Structure formats: structure tokens, C-alpha cells
């Protein structure tokens with residue numbers, strides 16, 4: 001499609017419109033926070049929070065129909081979805097609350113999905129690499145700590161904003 | 168990113184918002200109806216034009232910044248672009264008037280481009296295959312009234328809507 005969806009800006013906001021039941025809000029703010037950070041660490045993109053008003057990336061929690069062309073389908077199949085850079089609905093990320101969000105590995109871990117969604121919200125498509133973050137099918141890490149941006153994710157995203165240096 | 172990006176209804180609507188100085192208005196209307204037919208003949212879908220109100224596929228001619236994340240670039244480079252099915256901007260098609268739209272093949276034939284574009288509006292993607300309607304690089308083609316779909320495009324479209332009811 002004519003033009004790689006990418007922020008022509010470097011300083012981006014987000015607004016966590018609401019929170020899931022499955023976790024303590026402070027657990028959700030973190031996930032959302034580290035997830036943003038994995039992209040801050042490998043590029044010059046910087047992100048600020050909004051507690052009102054339309055933000056680039058509006059994060060939220062939904063179920064079934066919820067305002068956009070892609071309803072959720074209950075437990076399983078789709079876990080979330082995000083939209084590439086642009087005005088309005090673009091940049092956004094929605095998580096299906098019919099999935100169980102976790103800080104750990106009990107099932108669907110928020111940090112991990114969130115982190116993949118921001119890839120999309122930044123301009124990343126899926127990768128065909130079994131080890132990468134933008135791979136289309138979710139996979140859980142017995143140990144959250146050994147978590148890293150496969151160098152497949154890093155280039156991909158850098159090919160869009162470049163290395164950290166601050167552009 | 169995730170989720171089958173097709174219209175869920177077969178009866179899609181469309182509107183020509185405005186025209187190009189380049190060619191008579193009936194030219195443009197006709198290049199557009201054929202564009203639509205190129206896809207009627209190979210699927211179930213049906214189109215009906217509107218002369219007011221918001222339509223699925225909003226068709227218009229523009230230049231440079233014109234209401235979306237992707238302003239046009241002047242003569243050459245990009246000629247048009249269109250959006251997958253869904254709400255608002257989704258489904259619309261836009262034509263860079265910095266280009267010179269022609270009935271024949273002296274310049275950039277409205278029909279061929281319109282044909283490619285509707286395809287996007289319908290959910291199709293660009294091609295790797297080189298003899299198809301979706302290959303990213305445009306090319307003039309005489310005889311027009313005897314235009315045909317490649318199998319790639321054919322396979323592209325039916326993967327989404329199937330064969331025309333039509334036995």
C-alpha cells in the first residue's frame with residue numbers, strides 16, 4: 001500500500017481508556033509501560049500518557065462487538081488486534097476481555113500481547129520467524145525475564161524509525 | 168492486521184464525489200462502472216451508485232494533502248491508493264489529479280487504475296506475480312474493452328468472496 005504506515009512524529013501519546021477485571025490496575029499500567037519501552041529501547045520514539053482526550057494510541061479492553069469492523073470472538077482465536085499509524089482509530093490497540101490477562105504465564109500474559117500490539121501500533125506487520133515478537137501466533141515464556149526483541153523485531157522496527165540516537 | 172478483511176455484505180454501494188478536469192465526466196463514470204464490473208464478473212458482489220450520503224466506496228479525485236494519512240505526491244510516483252473494507256475511510260478510493268487520466272493509453276487510463284483500486288477496496292493486496300491487475304507497477308494496455316483478470320487476481324478475489332453464484 002502506498003506508503004509504510006509510520007508516525008511522521010517521534011513523540012507519541014497513549015490513553016488507557018479502561019481496565020480489565022483480570023488484573024489490578026497497577027498490573028495493567030506496568031504491562032502497558034514495559035510494552036511501550038521495548039520499542040523505546042530500540043528506536044527514538046518517545047511516549048507520553050494522557051488521562052483524557054484522544055491520544056495516538058488509545059489502549060482499551062473489549063468483548064464481542066465494540067465499535068470497529070472487527071468484533072472479538074470470545075475465548076480463543078483472537079487475543080487482541082491493533083491498528084497501524086494514522087488518525088482516529090489507527091494506532092489503537094484493543095484487548096479481548098474474554099481472554100484471561102495475567103502478569104505471569106497462567107495463560108495469556110498482558111505484557112507479551114501488548115508488546116506485539118504496539119509493534120502494529122507503530123507499523124509492524126507479522127514476521128514469519130518462529131522466534132520473533134511480531135510472529136502471528138502467541139507463545140508463552142516460562143520465564144518472563146528471558147524475553148528479548150528477536151533481532152527480527154529489532155531491524156523491522158528500526159527499518160521504520162532507526163536506532164536509538166533520537167531522530 | 169489479524170481478521171479476514173472483506174465486506175460482510177455482498178451489496179456494496181459507492182459514490183463519485185467529484186471529477187477530474189482531464190476527461191469528460193461520462194468518461195470517468197464509465198471507467199468506474201467497468202472497474203466495478205471487472206469484479207462483478209468474477210464474484211457474487213453487486214454495486215449500486217449513490218448521489219448523496221456516505222457510501223462504502225467513496226470515489227474522488229485529489230492532489231497533495233487531501234484528508235488522510237497519505238497526501239499525494241505530484242505528477243508520477245504514486246497514482247492512487249485505496250483502503251480495505253470497513254467503516255469511514257475504509258473502502259474509499261482516491262485519485263491523484265496530478266496524473267493525466269485518459270480513456271486510451273496516452274497517459275494513465277482511469278479504468279485500469281480504477282480496476283486495481285476497487286480490488287483494494289474489496290480486500291485484495293498487491294502482487295508479486297507480474298502479469299496481474301494487482302502487481303504494484305502500472306502499465307498501459309490497449310484493446311481495453313477486452314480486458315481480463317489474471318488467475319492470480321482471480322484466485323486473490325475468490326479466496327475472499329468465492330465464485331459468482333452463477334452456474
Ligand SMILES: COC(=O)[C@@H](NC(=O)CNC(=O)[C@H](CS)NCc1ccc(-c2ccccc2)cc1)C(C)C
Nearest residue numbers: 076077078079080112113116133136137138139169
Ligand atoms: C491463546 O492463543 C490463541 O488461542 C490463539 N491466537 C493467537 O495467538 C492469535 N494472534 C493474535 O491474536 C494477534 C494478532 S495481532 N497476535 C497476538 C500475539 C501476542 C503475543 C505474541 C507473542 C509472540 C512471541 C512471543 C510472545 C508472544 C504473538 C501474538 C492461537 C495462537 C491458537
Ligand SMILES: COC(=O)[C@@H](NC(=O)CNC(=O)[C@H](CS)NCc1ccc(-c2ccccc2)cc1)C(C)C
Nearest residue numbers: 243244245246247279280283299300303304305306
Ligand atoms: C514505477 O511505476 C510506475 O511507473 C507507475 N507508478 C506505479 O505504478 C505506482 N503505483 C500506484 O500508485 C498504485 C499502488 S496502489 N498502483 C496502481 C496500479 C493500477 C493498475 C495496475 C495495473 C496492473 C496490471 C495491468 C494494468 C494495470 C497496476 C498498479 C506510474 C508512476 C507510471
Ligand SMILES: [Ca+2]
Nearest residue numbers: 056088090091
Ligand atoms: Ca488513534
Ligand SMILES: [Ca+2]
Nearest residue numbers: 074076078079
Ligand atoms: Ca478471542
Ligand SMILES: [Ca+2]
Nearest residue numbers: 097098099100
Ligand atoms: Ca478477561
Ligand SMILES: [Ca+2]
Nearest residue numbers: 241243245263
Ligand atoms: Ca502522484
Ligand SMILES: [Ca+2]
Nearest residue numbers: 223255257258
Ligand atoms: Ca468508506
Ligand SMILES: [Ca+2]
Nearest residue numbers: 189264266267
Ligand atoms: Ca489531472
Ligand SMILES: [Zn+2]
Nearest residue numbers: 068070081094
Ligand atoms: Zn477492536
Ligand SMILES: [Zn+2]
Nearest residue numbers: 116136168169
Ligand atoms: Zn498481530
Ligand SMILES: [Zn+2]
Nearest residue numbers: 233235237261
Ligand atoms: Zn487519499
Ligand SMILES: [Zn+2]
Nearest residue numbers: 283287293303
Ligand atoms: Zn495497489
